[PDB]
Amino acid sequence: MDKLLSSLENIEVDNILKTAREFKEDTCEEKINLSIGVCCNDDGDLHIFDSVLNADKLVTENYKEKPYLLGNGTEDFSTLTQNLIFGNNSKYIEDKKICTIQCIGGTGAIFVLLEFLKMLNVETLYVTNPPYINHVNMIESRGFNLKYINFFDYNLIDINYDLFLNDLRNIPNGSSVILQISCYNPCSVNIEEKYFDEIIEIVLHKKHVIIFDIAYQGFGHTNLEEDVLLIRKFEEKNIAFSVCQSFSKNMSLYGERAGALHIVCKNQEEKKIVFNNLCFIVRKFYSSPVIHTNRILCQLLNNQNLKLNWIKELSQLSQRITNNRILFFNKLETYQKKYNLNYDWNVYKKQRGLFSFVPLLAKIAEHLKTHHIYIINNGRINVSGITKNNVDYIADKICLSLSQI
Amino acid sequence: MDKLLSSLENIEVDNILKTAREFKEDTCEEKINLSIGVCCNDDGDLHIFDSVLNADKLVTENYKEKPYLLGNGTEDFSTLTQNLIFGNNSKYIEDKKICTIQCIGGTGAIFVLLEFLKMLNVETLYVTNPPYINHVNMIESRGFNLKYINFFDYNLIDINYDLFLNDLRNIPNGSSVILQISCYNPCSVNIEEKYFDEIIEIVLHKKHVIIFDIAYQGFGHTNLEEDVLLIRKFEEKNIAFSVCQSFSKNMSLYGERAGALHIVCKNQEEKKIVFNNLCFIVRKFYSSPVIHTNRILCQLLNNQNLKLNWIKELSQLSQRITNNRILFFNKLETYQKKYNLNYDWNVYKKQRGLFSFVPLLAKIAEHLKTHHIYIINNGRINVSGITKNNVDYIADKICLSLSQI
Ligand SMILES: Cc1ncc(COP(=O)(O)O)c(C=O)c1O
Ligand SMILES: Cc1ncc(COP(=O)(O)O)c(C=O)c1O
Structure with missing residues (x-):
């Protein structure tokens, strides 16, 4: 009883x-x-898109078996997907420097990464004020110190770039920081290119560890490569970082829980380790990702007529x-x-x-x-x-x- | 860097x-x-079944939108699904005494439940020897005491029902215990009905809290209601417990990660609470379940011609x-x-x-x-x-x- x-x-x-x-x-x-x-x-x-409705059909046409993902993602998933954030072509991609994994939406990627941070000497996380609510819950409820960096200016109604870079300058060293660079939730204010370069310099001096939160590629601008510029600039003159990526709004895949996690690694041999750590971590939770939502994504993204038909409706959306x-x-x-x-x-x-x-x-x-x-x-x-x-x-x-x- | x-x-x-x-x-x-x-x-x-391949088709025919699951499951999911474990009709089902939720496979249900147990005064978990490996990893790596109950007899090659009920009798009181009653992994030895009744009596005296692990309904016997008898017997003269249910092998849905969690509640008003606790818990991880795998399941299970066509191939399988x-x-x-x-x-x-x-x-x-x-x-x-x-x-x-x- x-x-x-x-x-x-x-x-x-x-x-x-x-x-x-x-x-x-x-x-x-x-x-x-x-x-x-x-x-x-x-x-x-x-x-909901038509590209997505077609990817769906396409998927129940090309696939009859439903295997466990070894795997934590596919090989197409982890290359097709990372194209979107790092563009093409990248110094990082074809040099096998990114370890990427399929998660259960953006939330699903955030949390595995936080589980991955407890794994290390990570006691404190910085978040920009005001923060995406769940970040607060997800961080705190696993006993990290949560600290806030100045950001949105409440009276001017824009980022306060003066106080934002200030804190960015006197917050320890190799501090771990979560940034929403575009389509900010809730602020809805993106970081102007005017300021990228200064950041790169600060981030280089302080050797900070950055985690980018990308839930809405293609909503801040007309071109969807725009929304992710800071990341690409970061990549040139290579710095290391992490990316949590959701397709809940991108592809209108809400309930499918489509997401990815990208971690940038020093060599082709750190990639191999982090991978095992992640698989390990995943196995005390749900063991593997959804194969259907993996397939839907590869099909769309891998076919030009759909990628191009989607990007368009996407550009027509923002x-x-x-x-x-x-x-x-x-x-x-x-x-x-x-x-x-x-x-x-x-x-x-x-x-x-x-x-x-x-x-x-x-x-x-x-x-x-x-x-x-x-x-x-x-x-x-x-x-x-x-x-x-x-x-x-x-x-x-x-x-x-x-x-x- | x-x-x-x-x-x-x-x-x-x-x-x-x-x-x-x-x-x-x-x-x-x-x-x-x-x-x-x-x-x-x-x-x-x-x-892979044909019923399942047809449920798949059926699903991309009846559905065009893909919403977040509010929800942690549907209403059909939580009734259709629990039919399989509690049969029909149940004292528990139509009296709204079971709180059930859609998880990411059996693993996904086990872990949310363990997260749910840390939530309470649960310091120690009993597992039958030898145990499904991951149980060990999942339990331990969140700082529970893991203790072992005698079970499989290594020289006779059958359950040692004498020593099994012994431990079942001197292990504290209201101890939390995980049981694989059928298709044991790894033993492959199921509990004979000869012994159900004695257990019910022990479990009643000691008021133990039981968590049934059901990964293979329909592999231990020819009839698949057989495999889950202890549960149904338990239900008569009502005792409370929990069920982690996987359809990874049942429906051959491996990568889909189809699973459920059933918790038996005192009244229609405890159901409401536990639910909020679970949603809460789920939100510091992945926020909601996969809508596709939800739909595939409802479609199959809800249609007689498929349920019956599946059960048959299933019975033909064991x-x-x-x-x-x-x-x-x-x-x-x-x-x-x-x-x-x-x-x-x-x-x-x-x-x-x-x-x-x-x-x-x-x-x-x-x-x-x-x-x-x-x-x-x-x-x-x-x-x-x-x-x-x-x-x-x-x-x-x-x-x-x-x-x-
Ligand atoms: C900033 C931010 N990060 C992460 C997420 C998580 O998205 P998902 O529901 O697909 O996991 C959201 C919501 O879309 C969000 O707004
Ligand atoms: C005893 C037992 N419990 C739970 C599971 C978890 O199954 P799933 O991979 O669908 O989460 C398994 C494997 O099927 C198992 O053998």
Whole structure:
């Protein structure tokens, strides 16, 4: 007879779920969904490519057996995939200097890497303020010291590049740091090239260890190689680092949990070791990755007509989004007038990625629910869920709501 | 510049991989594969059903969107699945007393449960001797005390039911115990019904907490509800427990990593809590399960023509295997004569599951490699990989090899 459940309390979850509850917990239709990590279609329902639907078909055509992955990934997976981050061709790729592995989405790659860091002398991790929430949970709940680096400027609404590089300069030495360089979650502010070179110099002097978080290649810009420039610049005049890569939004592969982990190694013989360490680590958890989601990925990425058909719809996507964001603040500059409010909404258009980040709205978050619109506690906003129909209602209620103070 | 890799040593892996290396590391064709966890076809290559190939097709027909699983499983998944272990109908199922969740294979379910046990006052875990290897690794490498209960009798070659229930009687109280009741890995010896009732009585007096490991429903017997009887008996006169369930061999879904976790709860309101705890736990790892492998499973299991077509091929499978095992020792009783050896091979036919377990062979394991046949260090033997062609060569070399002492 299980009694263990006697000491069993219930838990407060992340901001991201108290709200997920709330969206689908009331009677009203015309409910609005602006908190979800997902990207919405024109019809306000989940997105999916055709390239991906075709990769799917392609996969159940070419494959009949379903083997365990030896493996922690394929050979095509680990080359096709790393093309996307390091481009082509690379000093690193064809010299077999990258050890890459298939994980369970970006989350899945982050966590194995953290498990891999406990493996070493890694007591402390730096994260840029404010940080992707789960990073906090994932880091902390395995007893690392979590420290914060200055980043987003809360009053200017841009990165504070002065204080960011400052901390980057007086934080020990060979400190381990997590960077979101593009499509920042939640900030939605990417690092301008103006500053790459200085960083490279700081990172070289301090010999820091960098972990790049790449969840949205192709949302910050029109060209998707742009979004990953710092990495490529880093590679030239070779520095070592790590990459957690998600395709949850890239390929619209949400539930498939498609992700990768890239670790840059000194020689063809360190690659071999780290690999065994990783396989080892993976075996006290789930032993191996999903073969289906491996196949779907190789098929798409490995075929030109699909890669090119996808990249296009992808390029066509970031456009619509950054456009939708422009439109949005323009409706707020307007409705604003009805309530005689005096806010500069122009400063949130600079922003890029799946969201916009309006700290000001943190104040109005629980009042925006009396009307049937849901938004994260901190100001973050799923832009992809604002239809041509939606703008008025939303923008109005934001102002209406704002004026009650 | 990554320096961390300075303290980086390479690791000795489990017996199961030093060998996996070895199988595919030599020039000889007519190499024989008797170590692999997988089940081999007539042609000595990996198995797969037609029901499963059809579920696959079915799935890419009915589904176009790919959402995150809220969720940690579906509603169909958690009812369809638990039918298989608790039968139908159950006192537990329709009274919403089971909390079940979709995991990444059996491994994936074992580990979340262990993470769930650290969550409580669980300092010590009992395992039956000898234990599924990974259990050792998974338990220990998170700082539980691992203790062993008497089980398999090494000289008689059957369970020692006398000493097994003994320990079961003097091991603290509400001790947490892992049981493989059928298709034991490695032993290949299942618990006879003769003894179920006594156990139920012991487990009731000592209030122990049981975790059943079910990786092979349908390999121990002809009827696949048989293999899970103890569980169903346990359910009548309701006791609480847990189930880790893999479909890696059941559905031949190896790389798909299909698995489930069942926890039996006091009321419809403990279910709700444990659920939140589990979601919580899952979120410091991979956040959610694979949607594809969820869909493949529901489709098969939910459609009669496929469930029935699968169960049949399944029932047709355990037959062939236990037959293949009978044949095998009969060739060893024969070739044995050529070398004038005097071993009783009849005692290994009782055995059941994907393997046979012959401790005697542990002695001959590294000599059986000079001939091109591979076998685990402890005696375990993948029976499914012995073709009508193979018997002679294998059985001969075993005897030949045995006689060199
Ligand atoms: C910054 C960041 N890192 C990692 C992830 C993890 O993505 P996934 O759900 O595919 O693991 C996300 C969410 O997409 C994210 O926004
Ligand atoms: C006893 C036992 N438990 C758990 C597992 C884990 O199976 P999976 O690879 O699907 O996670 C296995 C292997 O099939 C096993 O033999």
